[PDB]
């Protein structure tokens, strides 16, 4: 259903709201009308390493099979998790980079429009001059 | 979890407007439209579209759908019937873009 606060939104309370704002600026339904407050190089050098280790574990997992394999698969799990950590470090950085790209594109577009109209105007002027050079 | 807060209650309620069937259930009523209370509440919930209240909105649709309904309550069954078909056309594309 709908929240209970809706029962405090009558036209009379809306008529009493401005003076309650001016009075409170200097507990009730009019407080229900007031909105609530707001609550209170890099990793690329390691990724390679991790990658190189992953294969090295896979070989082990191949070379075991016996009941020893279990122990090995544990280590493998840890490696994969590490990979995920570094990618987490790539989540916000790439976002900012994307913003950069967008802005640059905007700049280029801006100049392109003007350039188009410019060349058109030039052509027009030349054409008229030609006609002039044929009469006198 | 402990007792809720009016901020989270109004936040989850305005965020519930992103669902189409829920808005359909809210509009296909007969009691909440006899008195000018639910309309003034929806028009009151327009503070989430402005910062810093917009920093907690997870679904961008619920806000704009709210502005549509607040845009429609100013000026019965038929139009209420009219909106969901169109929004239905819109949904799946965004769903494809999400995941």
């Amino acid at each position: 259903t709908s929240p209970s606060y809706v029962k405090f939104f009558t036209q009379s309370n809306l008529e009493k709201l401005p003076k309650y704002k001016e009075k409170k600026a200097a507990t009730c339904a009019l407080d229900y009308l007031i909105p609530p407050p707001m609550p209170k190089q890099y990793k690329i050098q390691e990724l390679r390493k991790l990658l190189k280790s992953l294969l090295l574990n896979y070989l082990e997992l191949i070379g075991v099979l016996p009941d020893m394999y279990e122990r090995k698969v544990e280590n493998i799990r840890t490696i994969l998790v590490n990979i995920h950590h570094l990618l987490n470090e790539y989540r916000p950085h790439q976002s900012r980079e994307s913003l950069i790209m967008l802005l640059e594109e905007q700049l280029e577009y801006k100049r392109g429009e003007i350039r188009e109209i410019e060349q058109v105007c030039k052509q027009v002027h030349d054409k008229l001059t030609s006609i002039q050079d044929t009469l006198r | 979890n402990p007792l809720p807060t009016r901020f989270e209650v109004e936040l989850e309620f305005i965020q519930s407007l992103a669902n189409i069937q829920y808005v359909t259930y809210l509009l296909t009523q007969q009691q909440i439209w006899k008195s000018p209370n639910f309309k003034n509440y929806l028009k009151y919930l327009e503070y989430w579209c402005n910062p810093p209240y917009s920093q907690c909105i997870v679904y961008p649709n619920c806000l704009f759908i709210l502005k549509l309904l607040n845009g429609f309550m100013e000026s019965x069954x038929x139009x209420x019937x009219x909106x969901x078909x169109x929004x239905x056309x819109x949904x799946x594309x965004x769903x494809x873009x999400x995941x």
Partner: peptide, 16 residues
Amino acid sequence: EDALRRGMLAMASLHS
């Protein structure tokens, strides 16, 4: 419709 009944909309619209 599950996040409303499992969240806070059910209880907030029920305690009154």
